[PDB]
Each structure stands twice: as structure tokens, then as C-alpha cells.
Design a protein around this motif. Sequence first.
Motif, PDB file in Angstrom:
ATOM      1  N   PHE A   1      69.693  77.846  80.054  1.00 44.75           N
ATOM      2  CA  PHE A   1      69.766  78.872  79.024  1.00 44.75           C
ATOM      3  C   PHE A   1      70.402  78.329  77.755  1.00 44.75           C
ATOM      4  CE2 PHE A   1      69.071  81.461  82.705  1.00 44.75           C
ATOM      5  CZ  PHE A   1      68.264  82.465  82.224  1.00 44.75           C
ATOM      6  N   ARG A   2      69.737  78.563  76.632  1.00 38.74           N
ATOM      7  CA  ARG A   2      70.188  78.160  75.312  1.00 38.74           C
ATOM      8  C   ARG A   2      70.695  79.379  74.562  1.00 38.74           C
ATOM      9  NH1 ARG A   2      69.168  73.837  72.048  1.00 38.74           N
ATOM     10  NH2 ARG A   2      69.371  72.737  74.043  1.00 38.74           N
ATOM     11  N   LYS A   3      71.692  79.164  73.721  1.00 35.69           N
ATOM     12  CA  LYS A   3      72.254  80.232  72.914  1.00 35.69           C
ATOM     13  C   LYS A   3      71.591  80.254  71.546  1.00 35.69           C
ATOM     14  CE  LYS A   3      76.586  81.920  71.189  1.00 35.69           C
ATOM     15  NZ  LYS A   3      78.036  81.617  71.119  1.00 35.69           N
ATOM     16  N   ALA A   4      71.139  81.429  71.131  1.00 37.83           N
ATOM     17  CA  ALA A   4      70.420  81.547  69.872  1.00 37.83           C
ATOM     18  C   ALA A   4      71.374  81.313  68.714  1.00 37.83           C
ATOM     19  CB  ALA A   4      69.777  82.922  69.760  1.00 37.83           C
ATOM     20  N   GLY A   5      71.045  80.362  67.862  1.00 44.12           N
ATOM     21  CA  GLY A   5      71.866  80.083  66.712  1.00 44.12           C
ATOM     22  C   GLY A   5      71.704  78.646  66.266  1.00 44.12           C
ATOM     23  N   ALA A   6      72.729  78.173  65.567  1.00 45.18           N
ATOM     24  CA  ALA A   6      72.736  76.868  64.919  1.00 45.18           C
ATOM     25  C   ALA A   6      71.451  76.647  64.130  1.00 45.18           C
ATOM     26  CB  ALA A   6      72.949  75.756  65.944  1.00 45.18           C
ATOM     27  N   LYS A   7      71.251  77.520  63.147  1.00 43.87           N
ATOM     28  CA  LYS A   7      70.248  77.367  62.101  1.00 43.87           C
ATOM     29  C   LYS A   7      68.839  77.173  62.641  1.00 43.87           C
ATOM     30  CE  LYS A   7      73.186  77.547  58.685  1.00 43.87           C
ATOM     31  NZ  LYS A   7      73.532  76.319  57.935  1.00 43.87           N
ATOM     32  N   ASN A   8      68.529  77.629  63.851  1.00 45.86           N
ATOM     33  CA  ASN A   8      67.146  77.592  64.313  1.00 45.86           C
ATOM     34  C   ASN A   8      66.649  79.025  64.240  1.00 45.86           C
ATOM     35  OD1 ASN A   8      64.705  77.360  65.609  1.00 45.86           O
ATOM     36  ND2 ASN A   8      65.466  75.999  67.205  1.00 45.86           N
ATOM     37  N   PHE A   9      65.867  79.311  63.210  1.00 51.27           N
ATOM     38  CA  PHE A   9      65.469  80.695  62.956  1.00 51.27           C
ATOM     39  C   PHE A   9      64.419  81.218  63.922  1.00 51.27           C
ATOM     40  CE2 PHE A   9      67.323  78.995  59.124  1.00 51.27           C
ATOM     41  CZ  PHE A   9      68.327  79.902  58.927  1.00 51.27           C
ATOM     42  N   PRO A  10      63.346  80.490  64.245  1.00 49.31           N
ATOM     43  CA  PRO A  10      62.304  81.068  65.101  1.00 49.31           C
ATOM     44  C   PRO A  10      62.816  81.628  66.414  1.00 49.31           C
ATOM     45  CG  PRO A  10      61.514  79.070  64.149  1.00 49.31           C
ATOM     46  CD  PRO A  10      62.938  79.173  63.734  1.00 49.31           C
ATOM     47  N   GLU A  11      63.958  81.131  66.875  1.00 48.33           N
ATOM     48  CA  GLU A  11      64.474  81.508  68.180  1.00 48.33           C
ATOM     49  C   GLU A  11      65.240  82.826  68.167  1.00 48.33           C
ATOM     50  OE1 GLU A  11      63.466  79.805  70.715  1.00 48.33           O
ATOM     51  OE2 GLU A  11      62.465  78.444  69.324  1.00 48.33           O
ATOM     52  N   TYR A  12      65.704  83.283  67.006  1.00 42.64           N
ATOM     53  CA  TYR A  12      66.524  84.487  66.946  1.00 42.64           C
ATOM     54  C   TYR A  12      65.794  85.709  67.483  1.00 42.64           C
ATOM     55  CZ  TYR A  12      70.087  82.206  64.117  1.00 42.64           C
ATOM     56  OH  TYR A  12      71.093  81.389  63.670  1.00 42.64           O
ATOM     57  N   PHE A  13      66.572  86.609  68.072  1.00 44.65           N
ATOM     58  CA  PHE A  13      66.120  87.954  68.380  1.00 44.65           C
ATOM     59  C   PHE A  13      66.099  88.785  67.109  1.00 44.65           C
ATOM     60  CE2 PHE A  13      67.764  86.253  72.248  1.00 44.65           C
ATOM     61  CZ  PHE A  13      66.920  86.727  73.214  1.00 44.65           C
ATOM     62  N   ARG A  14      65.109  89.657  66.987  1.00 44.86           N
ATOM     63  CA  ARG A  14      64.999  90.494  65.806  1.00 44.86           C
ATOM     64  C   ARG A  14      64.633  91.906  66.221  1.00 44.86           C
ATOM     65  NH1 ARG A  14      62.759  85.722  64.645  1.00 44.86           N
ATOM     66  NH2 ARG A  14      63.724  84.507  62.964  1.00 44.86           N
ATOM     67  N   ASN A  15      65.053  92.871  65.410  1.00 44.50           N
ATOM     68  CA  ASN A  15      64.784  94.268  65.706  1.00 44.50           C
ATOM     69  C   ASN A  15      63.427  94.741  65.224  1.00 44.50           C
ATOM     70  OD1 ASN A  15      67.429  95.508  66.794  1.00 44.50           O
ATOM     71  ND2 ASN A  15      68.108  94.417  64.966  1.00 44.50           N
TER      72      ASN A  15
END
Lengths: 513, 513
Positions: free
Chosen positions: B240-254
Amino acid sequence: DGVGQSSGNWHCDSVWMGDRVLTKSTRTWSLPTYNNHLYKQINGSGTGDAVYFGYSTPWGYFDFNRFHCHFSPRDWQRLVNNHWGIRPRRLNFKLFNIQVKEVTTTDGTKTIANNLTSTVQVFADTEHQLPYILGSAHEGCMPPFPADVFMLPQYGYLTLNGPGSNNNNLSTPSSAFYCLEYFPSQMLRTGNNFVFTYEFEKVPFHSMFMHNQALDRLMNPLVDQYLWYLDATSGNNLTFRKAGAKNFPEYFRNWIPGPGCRNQQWNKVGTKNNPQTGTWASANKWRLQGRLNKYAPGQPNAPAEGFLTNAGDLAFANAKATGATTAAGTVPADILLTSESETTTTNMMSNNGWGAIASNNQNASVAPTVQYEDSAHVLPGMVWQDRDIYLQGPIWAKIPETDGHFHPSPLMGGFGLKNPPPQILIKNTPVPADPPTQFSSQKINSFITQYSTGQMTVEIEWELRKENSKRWNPEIQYTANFNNSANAQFSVNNNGLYIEDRTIGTRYLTHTL
Amino acid sequence: DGVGQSSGNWHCDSVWMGDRVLTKSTRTWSLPTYNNHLYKQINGSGTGDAVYFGYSTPWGYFDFNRFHCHFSPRDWQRLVNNHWGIRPRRLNFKLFNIQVKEVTTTDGTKTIANNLTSTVQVFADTEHQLPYILGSAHEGCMPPFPADVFMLPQYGYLTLNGPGSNNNNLSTPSSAFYCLEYFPSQMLRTGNNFVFTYEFEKVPFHSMFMHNQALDRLMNPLVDQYLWYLDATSGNNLTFRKAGAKNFPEYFRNWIPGPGCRNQQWNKVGTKNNPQTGTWASANKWRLQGRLNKYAPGQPNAPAEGFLTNAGDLAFANAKATGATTAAGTVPADILLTSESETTTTNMMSNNGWGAIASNNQNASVAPTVQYEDSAHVLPGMVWQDRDIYLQGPIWAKIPETDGHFHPSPLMGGFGLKNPPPQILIKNTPVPADPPTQFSSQKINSFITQYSTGQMTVEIEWELRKENSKRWNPEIQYTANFNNSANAQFSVNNNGLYIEDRTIGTRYLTHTL
């Protein structure tokens, strides 16, 4: 109301009551349809001093600006001999008895009918939101003589142009386009009429007086001044002279003559002049945006006696002169010259420079020298007269709105106004011809040919200054010529043509300086 | 009242007061007699995608629908730079100065006279009982420029057709026939005038702003999310990877981008395009009752930069283009393109599909695969922008009365209305020619040829939204072009023809997403 009853009456007269005078005038006008109901831009060609970009408009405008619209030659005489000043106060404008007529041509003949249901639409611009073309001394005003019928001029303006490759006529991003139908005008059939009122803001009286003294001549000749100056350096010592004993050039004075510049002078006798096929090369000029313009008229600088200048002073013409030119061995009989020579007591003359000035520093071994000043400008403690108003001249002008202006009086003479009388604009409402049965989205090309006519009136309240002067002896006044003539002056000829014989300025009575 | 006095005045202006703006406009119109005072059914031929059954009507209708009828190009600039929204409120309509004219032809020449006792008859349909042909973006509106005179279009509608043997043009038992004289209209001679008022129901403002952020870009870049996902399956264990460190495609969005579908894209450069003699074969289409229709315009899906689509976005033309076609190596100078690229921050682009999706189930011995979604539809939690309103575009449309509709905004842009402004219908009352002396029961075949003309006015009260934005730096605004041009922009040419140089959308100022 209705088709059967008239919407107004004829008022032309003048009423002299105390210090007010009230003039009324009416004329009959005829309005065509300009540009086939179209707006059109107009522009010059190539590069040069005359290049322009503008728009011609399907509108027409009433211009009453010029003086003799409002005054008969007797009322003018009566005005300028008895009074020291005049300024406008109020004006009242009316249109009435509108009637619109349609024209039909079968084969080569015209048949004019009368369309009762057609309208014209008119408005005045109170806020001065359109380009203001009045005060520029164009034609198309009310005629001098009340029985003449005139045609209204077309309205148009021109705007910024720009530097294309070989063309300075190219429009600029800031060139403005004004649509006059975007104004809330008033539509008038034959029965109804149009009116508005206006009120001038306070302006100074125009001075109707010629001065009684020169500047340099203001003093008591019988007593010398108490001021001392250095007359003579000779003898290795300084010699102070006391100003007085009837030597006028030496006196100290508080005031100095007005500004001006030299202007080329052309003798009225034709044989003495130099044969130039044009005077443009020799004219005084000012330049704006890289292009040169004649400088006319200058400040009211009188020429020498028996000389004149190139557009230095105003000039008019009779009704006998039609076309662009007239010529005679001397100044033609149709041309009406004006002369500012009444102002020579203060203003500078045009025949030579304003004065001399110190050229160099001196010592024992070098002589003092001076150089001559051809032009002058405004200095503290300096006085001048403004150019005179004539019977045929313009009454006012609009002071352009700018961050600064100095002594804002029109160089053609008049009353400079921040809020001049509103322009009045009128048009024939377009009536289309029979449309096709199948729908077509293109503009309607063809209309019904028609024109309109009616009467107008202008009523202006003038304020004027009483004359109290204790001079013993009589004064110059304006009088009719003393010769028996074939035609009486300011009157029609055999053929029925009204003729102004000469210009009339307002300066006769004198006043102390 | 009467023949002699006018029934109205000219009002064209704009008044900006606070958050209201009030526009007035007047034009001069010309109404012929359509169909020789007859109703006629019209129908197609044979089977195909275009087949119709309808009725042409001896009536004509005022259409003010399009925007620039109500706004001058300066008022539009002034509107779109300073404000975040606009919606209509009230309107006021008037006809006046009606005049009716009769035409007579002797030999081959026409003579137009003026019939004082003839009438026209007009009514507005408040209850929307007739077929509503407005909002369909036809021609025949008020011209842009107030000095143009236009001819009113003919009224007509078309109705259900049916499957005959070789003909789908055959009428159906439910085809409706509307007689417009079965309405209680109002008959107007030259003196009297017509007026009514209308009030819009509450609608949401049209958004004049372009967004300040993309959807996927809404976040704080400086801190990582607290949400975890499965990045890597390798090594016989889950990572499991934590979303962050300037990788935008991976973020959760509403929120997720709006709906749309692909559309064939045609490069503006003509040499790169594929030589098809028509684009109908390649267009996006929807079909109804077994016949196919181009799908235009789609949802506001912008194309790639430097590309366009087939009827995907609106397009206009100058007054210089007459006829049905224009052609040039690139998009012609007469054609006015529109672009939705301001919406790419939310809406989907047309150059590729909406996204990918899982193709198959997996195991250790089979690899996971994905497939691409070319079209999308409405899902919960999804946001989009509506198509923009232009200066040349339609203002409103009528939401068809139906058991359901979703987000009822016109696909051409506008304000969808349940109760739109009432149609206005007008006709020349028929005047028969001299009847025979012996009675005959047949209809009267021959009438007196005549047409009518007059003026109209439209006054609309607009509501608009103030702009409060604290962004430091300056914003894009609409400005005139910076080149010196032969003809000033949005202005007449030498020949007198008014020209819109380009379309203007309302979205310049930005807003946070």
C-alpha cells in the motif's frame, strides 16, 4: 392638431427693452434624404498634409450660429453705435408646420405628391456626446434675408487616422463610430411640433469700444517721472538721466503690448506684389502629427496700412460670387475684407517684429549689440484685445475639453463656451418600397423617394452694456454711404438677389485705456 | 390620434443603473402579403431522412430573440468585462406609426399609393397555444445595426407525418391544423398603436466567468493526503502506497469531469484534412422515428487546439456572405467561429474518450487489461459548464412540455423557459377587388395588392451579478484589435454595409472553482 390646423405662427422681429434685446427669426427649410439612408465611411488617398478618416451620415442639422441670422443691418447699426458690449443669455428653438412630400418619376417627368402619414425624426444633443461640428464656420446657416429658402446641410464627422504602409488614411483602433439612431429622438408627423430651450453660462461682454489711448502714451505729459536711468557711459564714468522732459520712449511703464508673430504682407495694389502661383509656400504654419497646417487666423495683429495677409484676418463674399475663386487687379468687389486696425493701440502689428533684445555681453574692447525678436508669447503684465465680432461672423465655439487652455477665446472671434448650444439633428424616416412575396433576409435596398420641408424659429435673449462716456466731442459712428447708387445698400437688386455691401465690425465708440 | 399626429417616438439607448441594465431598441419593418391571404399545406416527397407535413400561413411574426438586437458592441464589452452574470427580468413591446400602402401596376410600371383606411391585425399568444417556432435560431430578427430596415418573416409550422406506401409525407389522423383567425386579434389603422408587457420567471444567472482551476488540480500541493491505495502487487504480497508527494494522478478526488462523447475533428489547415465531398457520413447522429439526424451541437466539449468539428460548435457569418456556401484554404474570413476551450477545466474534450475501465477479471496466470470509454453520460457527483452565450447567439428557448427533462438548458446556449416570451403575429387584412354584379357563392379570388410598414420597439430589463474578486494580478479582457485597419471594427465600410468582425463570448473574468 390634425392635418387641418397649423402648428405655429411666423415670428420675426426685434425688441429693445432697457439693457436687454430680444431677437426672433424664422426661415423655411428643405431637407433631402442623404446617402440613401446609409452611413458611409469617407477617407482620403495616399500620404500628405490632407488625409482623413470619417463617416458621412444620413442626417441633417440646423445651424443658426452666424450673427446676421439674428440681426438686420438696421438692428446692427442701432446696436453698435449705442452700446459698449453684448453677450447672449437664453435661446428658444422651435420647428413647426412640418410637411413631407414624395416624388415619383414616370418616363422622364417628376410628379410630387404629399404624404400625410410620413414622419421626420429630430433630437438635440444636450450632453454633447456626438462630435461637435459647429463653431467651425461652415456654410448652411439661416440666410441673412428672411425671404430666402435654404436647404439643410448634411451631417458628418471625421476621426483619427493612422500610418499604413503608403497610406495615412488607415483607420486606428480608437477611431470612433457613432450611430445617431442609438439616441432617443422624437418622431413628428405633419401636425405636431418640436421645441426646446437653452441658457448660456456667464461669459464676459464682448468689448464694442475702440481705445482712446495707446499704451506707450498713458501718462501725464506735463510732469516728468521721478525715475532715473543710465543714459550715457562715456567719459569713464556713469551718467544717470532723469526720465521726463517730453521724451516718451524713455519712460518707465507698467504694461507692455500683446503677443503675436510676423506674417507675410501682400499689397492691395496688384502690380507691386510678387507673382506667386500660390501663397501656401509663404504662409505662417503650425504642424500637428507630422503634417503642416496654415496658421489662420493669427492673433489680431493688424497689418500695415494698405496691406493684407494670407488668411490673417477674416474675409467674406457676396451672393454674387459663386464658385471657388474671384480675381481682380485689386481686392475684388465681391470680397469683403475685415481689418483689426482698431486694435493697434494695444496689440502688435504684423509688419515687423515685437522688439529688440541684448545680443551679447560687453567690455571696454567690444561694443554692445542687439538682435530683433520676430515672435512673442505671453509674459506677465501684458495686455491685448481679442478679435472683433462682425455681422457675418460666427457667434460662438466650443472650448475643447482638455487638461489646459489659455485665454479660451476663439481665434476667429466669438464666445468660447464650455457647454455650447446643442446641435440639432433631423432625418427623413425611411419608408420601404413594396417587398417581395418570398422572404429574403438581406437588407432592404429600395425605398420611396421623399423629402420634407417646414419652418423654424430662433429666439435669443441678448444682454448688453450701457454706454456712459463724458467725452465732449462727437464720435465715429456707422453710417450708410453718401453716394447715390444704382442699388440701395443692403437691399435686393433688379433680379431679386440680396446683397451685403460690406462687413460691419462692432467697434466705433471709444473708451479710455 | 387621427391621421395627422404620430403614435410614438424613437427610443434606442441603454441605461446602466446599479445591478440593473435596461436596453431599448427600435427598428423599421416591412410586411408583405404572404400566400395571397391563403393557408397552404406543405409536404416533402418520397422516403428519406428529410420528410415533412405542415402548413404555410398568411401571417408574419416579429422575432427579437437574438442578443445583439439588444446590445451594441460597446455595451457588450462594457457588460462582459465588468460582471459575473446576467439574466433577463422584464420586457416591453410596442408597435406604432403603422402605415399601409397599396400597389397598382399599369402596363409594366408600379405606382405606390397610401391607403388611410386599411388595417393590419396583430395579437400575441400568451398561453402558447400555437406551435412555437422561436428558439429554433431562424433568420428574420431585428438587424444588429439600428439604421437597417428589414422584412418580417412568414409564419409556418409543420406537424406529424405518416407512413404511406412509398411516402412518409402522408398526414396522420393527429396532424393538427391551426387557423390563426380563430384567435381574438387586434385591428389597427394608421393612428392607433399596440403594446404589451411580459415578465420572466426566475432563472439562474448565466456564468460569465472562466474557471481559475482545473478539477484534478483542486488541492493543497504542499501536504500529502492521508488516504492509502494499492500501488504494487509484486512479490507475492500487497504493497500500500500513501497518496501524496506531488504525484497528482494518484490523489482521491470528490468530483469528476462532465459528460460528453467523441466527435470527428477537422484541422483548420485544409491540406491535412481528408478530401470528403460531404461530412454527413462522418457526423455524430441521433435518430428519431427511424430517420437519422445530425447531433448538433453536442455538449460543450472543446476540440483540440487548431481543430474544429462538424456542427459541434456554433458558427456565424458576415453580411458579406450571401448564398449558401463559402470556401477558402483555411476557415473563411466571413465565417465567425466560436470556441468552448474556456471550459476545458471541467468539461470533457472531444479529441479522445472519457477514460479507461477494467476489461477483465485476473488471476496469477492472466494479466489485467483495460478498455477505453468513448462516450459518457450523467453520473452522481459530476460537474460541467453549459455552453456560452455570444453576442450573435439566441437568448432563450422553450422547454418542451414533457413528463421529464434533465438539466433543461438549450444545447445552443440560452435560458430555457417554461413560459417564454409570447410570439407576436401580424397580417395585412385582406381587401377585395370589385365584385361582380351577379351573385356568385365561390370564394373571392382577387384582392387589392398592398403592404404595410411601421416601427417597433423592445425594452428589456436585465439583472446582473456584481464581480467581487480579490486576485492580485490583472485579468484578460475584451479589447479591440491593435492593427490599423482599412475599416474600423464593428462599423460600416465605404459602401455602407455594417460588418461584425468576430464573435464575442461572455467569459473573460475568472472565478475560483
